[PDB]
Amino acid sequence: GLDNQIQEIKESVELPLTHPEYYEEMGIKPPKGVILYGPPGTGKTLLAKAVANQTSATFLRVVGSELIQKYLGDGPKLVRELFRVAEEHAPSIVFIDEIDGEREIQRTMLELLNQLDGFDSRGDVKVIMATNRIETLDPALIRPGRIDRKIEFPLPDEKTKKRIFQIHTSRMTLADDVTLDDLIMAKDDLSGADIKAICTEAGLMALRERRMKVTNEDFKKSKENVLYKKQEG
Amino acid sequence: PTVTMMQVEEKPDVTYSDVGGCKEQIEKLREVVETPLLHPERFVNLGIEPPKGVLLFGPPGTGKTLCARAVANRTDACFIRVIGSELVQKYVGEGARMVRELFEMARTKKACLIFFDEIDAIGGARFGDNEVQRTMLELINQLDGFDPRGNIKVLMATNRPDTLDPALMRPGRLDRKIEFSLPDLEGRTHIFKIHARSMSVERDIRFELLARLCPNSTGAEIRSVCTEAGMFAIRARRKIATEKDFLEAVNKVIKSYAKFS
Amino acid sequence: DDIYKTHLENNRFGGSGSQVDSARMNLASSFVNGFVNQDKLLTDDGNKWLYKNKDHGMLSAAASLGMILLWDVDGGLTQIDKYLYSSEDYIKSGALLACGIVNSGVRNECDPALALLSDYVLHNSNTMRLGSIFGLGLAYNREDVLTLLLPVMGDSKSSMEVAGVTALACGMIAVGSCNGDVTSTILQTIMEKSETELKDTYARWLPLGLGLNHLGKGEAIEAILAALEVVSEPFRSFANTLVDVCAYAGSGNVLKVQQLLHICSEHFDSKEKEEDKDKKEKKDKDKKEAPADMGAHQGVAVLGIALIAMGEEIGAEMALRTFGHLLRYGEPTLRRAVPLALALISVSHDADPEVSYNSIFAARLAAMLRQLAQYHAKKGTLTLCPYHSDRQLMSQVAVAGLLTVLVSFL
């Protein structure tokens, strides 16, 4: 169940310059964008909408907060770099992903909210924030940042990965006996590139033996990667 | 920083017609913010010092809209508001030179009106607090103290009346503490009367009908109603807004969002 | 089969034919509209759209119905006969041009076009000589039209495109001769080329007729023959290096590589442009040697040399990687020339460069060229020969009259 969500974010962030005649005539102008958050997250809606929105646009990749926490607290200097290159790339889409001591995270998040709010510029670029859990983020970010729309992902576990699995396996070839009860029952906090990654390493693992059929025990062996990926991080 | 020049609010905005049923309270606070502007010399001829300000607090409701009202109705020179978000910041102590430089700008802008929003940021110390004691005791020495002047406008807006010191220090200089009195069943139709200048409104819409089936729907939520009206009007390619079209947006935005809140 | 198994949309004909203005998007819309890539709505959109276009967009837009009719031999008669015997000159001259574009084996348009060409001074038969002689060259060692072009080669008319499409027409007719030829037409324009050395554009496109008449060589010494017979002041020495470009199709001739690096630092910055411009043909198979440090220099003309040396191949990531730094430049000649090779070498990184140029400009040159890129975003003789007519865009907008009739289309 994501058709209304993808036409609502399609109309939400594709109303600007890409087909713009329905945006600068009515006089609404919510030039703040949405903040992506998914209960599973981890590239499912982030990657799915990150590749689905690239039909005709300019993408800006910002993934992970490691470069801030792996060393001294440089802080908002790289935010100023991405803001001057986002200023030199104004008709783009600012996509910040994987937003994951606290005395400094609060001040670089306060300065991040201040510079991100558009305190020195009007609405010209669509800023998109992304995270795994929307509850870890302090509610003080919602009012300045989100004024346009926030999207929840009410996924049906069978028909989200069975519809995405069906569409994504209707053009390419695969193997038989592909079970789904352990998938919809066990998989959590993973993406569609992960079921595509285990079908690709499943059919590729069968390709190592030069076979086109995949055994159920081989699909559980590839499933173990999913079983440990959610337990590691 | 750039907030010191952001304190100026040009580009006029929402006018008097967003009064949320406070037909008398808007006089009980306009009497100090806008009345001493028409004839300031006549108050000096009266002998009494011009009034200082009032106190708005209680529920949020349609808060911060009355400052835009005070921007549009003041057609002479916009005023300066000080939100409490600039007080709770790292490396405290900047608010002293900040309030002295915005008071300096107040003396430079021929007695510019000064506003103070969100006192609850540093309010309620209940004595790490000494650095707050400096900013709030100096804040009393600069606001309740007659150092700048007993003059035109002093005001504190907040969501909690738990302020210990300002409540026992205001009666000397400040006065007229009144509740917010958010609009209920008689102000939302008038917020629709100021939203009449939005996207074309068909004369079939009854503001009372759209304003009576929405409990706890102050200017923010019905502002989102008038926002989703034009938004879904773009999503449906409609040329004129009619309540019978976006009624699903109304009962959706109040009911589907009032289920979990 | 292409109409059956594949289908094209109307976003580019209707879109790029609907946001037109400033009398130049009508030019680009007339050329892109002239392209076949089934739908013929923008052509049939009422009338007077050709009337609102310029004269070169009247040759291009009058030749649009011819360009969209590379097939349907019997349709070109009933489609072009409307533009025939019209009131405007470029409508009927571009109509005979379209008669030359529609087909290449019918050859029945010879007599009506050639019958009236004998005016030679200012009549409509001069533009009908452009479209009919160049278009007839596209429809073709044809010696009857060559003897008919002998007074045209000896016309010496100040109009550049007369001997432009005449030399390019006899050359494109004679591409592939056995070790070239020394015929009396290229020799005629060599002697008359020695008569008066004016209008250097003749010293740029007449050597194209020379070297295209010399096309087909594998070891011919005609470059040394002309290097002994037609050498003079730098202009005809630039003709000599044009014959050098048309004399090195490719063999084991490392002497051209040591001579290449030897003449890489010549004062004359145009023989480097052409002699180094031949890189796309000399080393066109060992693709590892083509990438060099030409962009790191300050001779922006060399950056244009590499830009031409990109080509029209599959367009790997290294190509567009060069089209990034070549795309970011201030001069309108290289910023206008980069979307041309960028569009020719490319056939979700197609509409994104268009938004990139939208980020560059937000002139009209890059607007027409960027709509040409809007269309073209998605050893052969005819598919590679007419590029040098496009390699002389650094001039007035009059190039659109000859750029619209390229035969490199598939």
UniProtKB/Swiss-Prot annotation, chain A:
GO terms for cellular component: cytosol; membrane; nucleoplasm; nucleus; proteasome accessory complex; proteasome complex; proteasome regulatory particle, base subcomplex. GO terms for biological process: proteasome-mediated ubiquitin-dependent protein catabolic process. It comes from the Eukaryota. One of its GO terms (molecular function) is proteasome-activating activity. It is found in: Cytoplasm; Nucleus; Membrane. There is a cross-link at K49 (Glycyl lysine isopeptide (Lys-Gly) (interchain with G-Cter in ubiquitin)). ATP binds at G38, P39, P40, G41, T42, G43, K44, T45. Disulfide bonds: none annotated. Keywords: Acetylation, ATP-binding, Cytoplasm, Deafness, Intellectual disability, Isopeptide bond, Lipoprotein, Membrane, Myristate, Nucleotide-binding, Nucleus, Phosphoprotein, Proteasome, Ubl conjugation. It is a lipid-anchor. The modification N6-acetyllysine is found at K70. The keyword Cell inner membrane does not apply. Component of the 19S proteasome regulatory particle complex. The 26S proteasome consists of a 20S core particle (CP) and two 19S regulatory subunits (RP). The regulatory particle is made of a lid composed of 9 subunits, a base containing 6 ATPases including PSMC1 and few additional components. Interacts with SCA7. Interacts with NGLY1. Interacts with PAAF1. It is linked to Birk-Aharoni syndrome: An autosomal recessive disorder characterized by failure to thrive, severe developmental delay, intellectual disability, spastic tetraplegia with central hypotonia, chorea, hearing loss, micropenis and undescended testes, as well as mild elevation of liver enzymes. Component of the 26S proteasome, a multiprotein complex involved in the ATP-dependent degradation of ubiquitinated proteins. This complex plays a key role in the maintenance of protein homeostasis by removing misfolded or damaged proteins, which could impair cellular functions, and by removing proteins whose functions are no longer required. Therefore, the proteasome participates in numerous cellular processes, including cell cycle progression, apoptosis, or DNA damage repair.
From Swiss-Prot, chain B:
The modification N6-acetyllysine is found at K259. Monoubiquitinated by RNF181. Induction: Expression is not cell cycle-dependent and occurs throughout the cell cycle. The keyword ATP-binding applies. One of its GO terms (cellular component) is ficolin-1-rich granule lumen. It is found in: Cytoplasm. Keywords: Acetylation, ATP-binding, Cytoplasm, Nucleotide-binding, Phosphoprotein, Proteasome, Ubl conjugation. Signal peptide: none annotated. GO terms for biological process: osteoblast differentiation; positive regulation of proteasomal protein catabolic process; proteasome-mediated ubiquitin-dependent protein catabolic process; ubiquitin-dependent protein catabolic process. Component of the 26S proteasome, a multiprotein complex involved in the ATP-dependent degradation of ubiquitinated proteins. This complex plays a key role in the maintenance of protein homeostasis by removing misfolded or damaged proteins, which could impair cellular functions, and by removing proteins whose functions are no longer required. Therefore, the proteasome participates in numerous cellular processes, including cell cycle progression, apoptosis, or DNA damage repair. Belongs to the AAA ATPase family. This is 26S proteasome regulatory subunit 7. The lineage of its organism: Eukaryota, Metazoa, Chordata, Craniata, Vertebrata. The gene is PSMC2. The chain holds residues 159 to 424 of 433 of the full protein.
Swiss-Prot record, chain C:
It comes from the Eukaryota. The modification Phosphoserine is found at S16, S18. It comes from Homo sapiens. The modification N6-acetyllysine is found at K199. This is 26S proteasome non-ATPase regulatory subunit 2. PC repeats lie at residues 60-93, 94-130, 131-162, 165-199, 208-237, 366-378. Component of the 19S proteasome regulatory particle complex. The 26S proteasome consists of a 20S core particle (CP) and two 19S regulatory subunits (RP). The regulatory particle is made of a lid composed of 9 subunits, a base containing 6 ATPases and few additional components including PSMD2. Interacts with RPGRIP1L. Interacts with CRY1 in a KDM8-dependent manner. Residues 271-293 are annotated as: Disordered. Component of the 26S proteasome, a multiprotein complex involved in the ATP-dependent degradation of ubiquitinated proteins. This complex plays a key role in the maintenance of protein homeostasis by removing misfolded or damaged proteins, which could impair cellular functions, and by removing proteins whose functions are no longer required. Therefore, the proteasome participates in numerous cellular processes, including cell cycle progression, apoptosis, or DNA damage repair. Binds to the intracellular domain of tumor necrosis factor type 1 receptor. The binding domain of TRAP1 and TRAP2 resides outside the death domain of TNFR1. Belongs to the proteasome subunit S2 family. The gene is PSMD2. Found in skeletal muscle, liver, heart, brain, kidney, pancreas, lung and placenta. Residues 271-291 have a biased composition (Basic and acidic residues).
